[PDB]
Amino acid sequence: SMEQVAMELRLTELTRLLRSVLDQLQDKDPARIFAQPVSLKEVPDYLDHIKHPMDFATMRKRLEAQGYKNLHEFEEDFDLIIDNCMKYNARDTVFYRAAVRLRDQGGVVLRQARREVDSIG
Template sequence: MNERRVPERHRASKRRRGGEVELSNILEKVVDQLRRNTAISYLFLKPVLKKDAPDYFNIVKRPMDLGTIRDKVRKMEYKNRKAFRHDVAQIAVNAHAYNDNRHRGIPPLADELLKMCDQLLEEHAGLLDDAEGAMEY
């Protein structure tokens, strides 16, 4: 009886791992498309540096950028699209928190970035459903 259980667990583990890999592949395509649209994304490609905005970290408590998101995708830290979207939304939250009263042109770019993210996630919804489904226990 034990002999049968080990392969079943192994198969389930392999299926979950395959789902994680597939999810990461899809999310990497999405983040790459966001990064390539530099008219919208150019300000959000890398972390904000203290030398560029000395008071940024007094206002923004959870910094986020597309480079960090890409790194998290590659490390397979996202277990679903909701967590990925949350980080993209954090870029918009931060842009509003820091720039609403300073640089009024920046928050709308972050809003466009989030809108584009939502569109891309919707375009890949079927594949994302499959990948996330393969990860269920």
């Protein structure tokens, strides 16, 4: 139908906007701490601690498959990155501190993304 096409074009444009958001968030992780999944070879008990692991490569795969239907879903995944890290790692670690900086710097990006998503529809 023409409606399904129109819906598909909306999703494609949302995907375009979320790709730009993702790139901007990932720039706030210059140490690449959050770039890839926590390795289960290196942290064999990780899944005993963290039930829903997340990282930027995993988000990117979902994004390029047009797997985010709205900004809320995308934000959920970004928040898992931060929140997983802040539980697994202690406050006095470079990992925890990286997550805090990512959260703080990403807030600004996500604030305007919400306005853009609502604005453009």
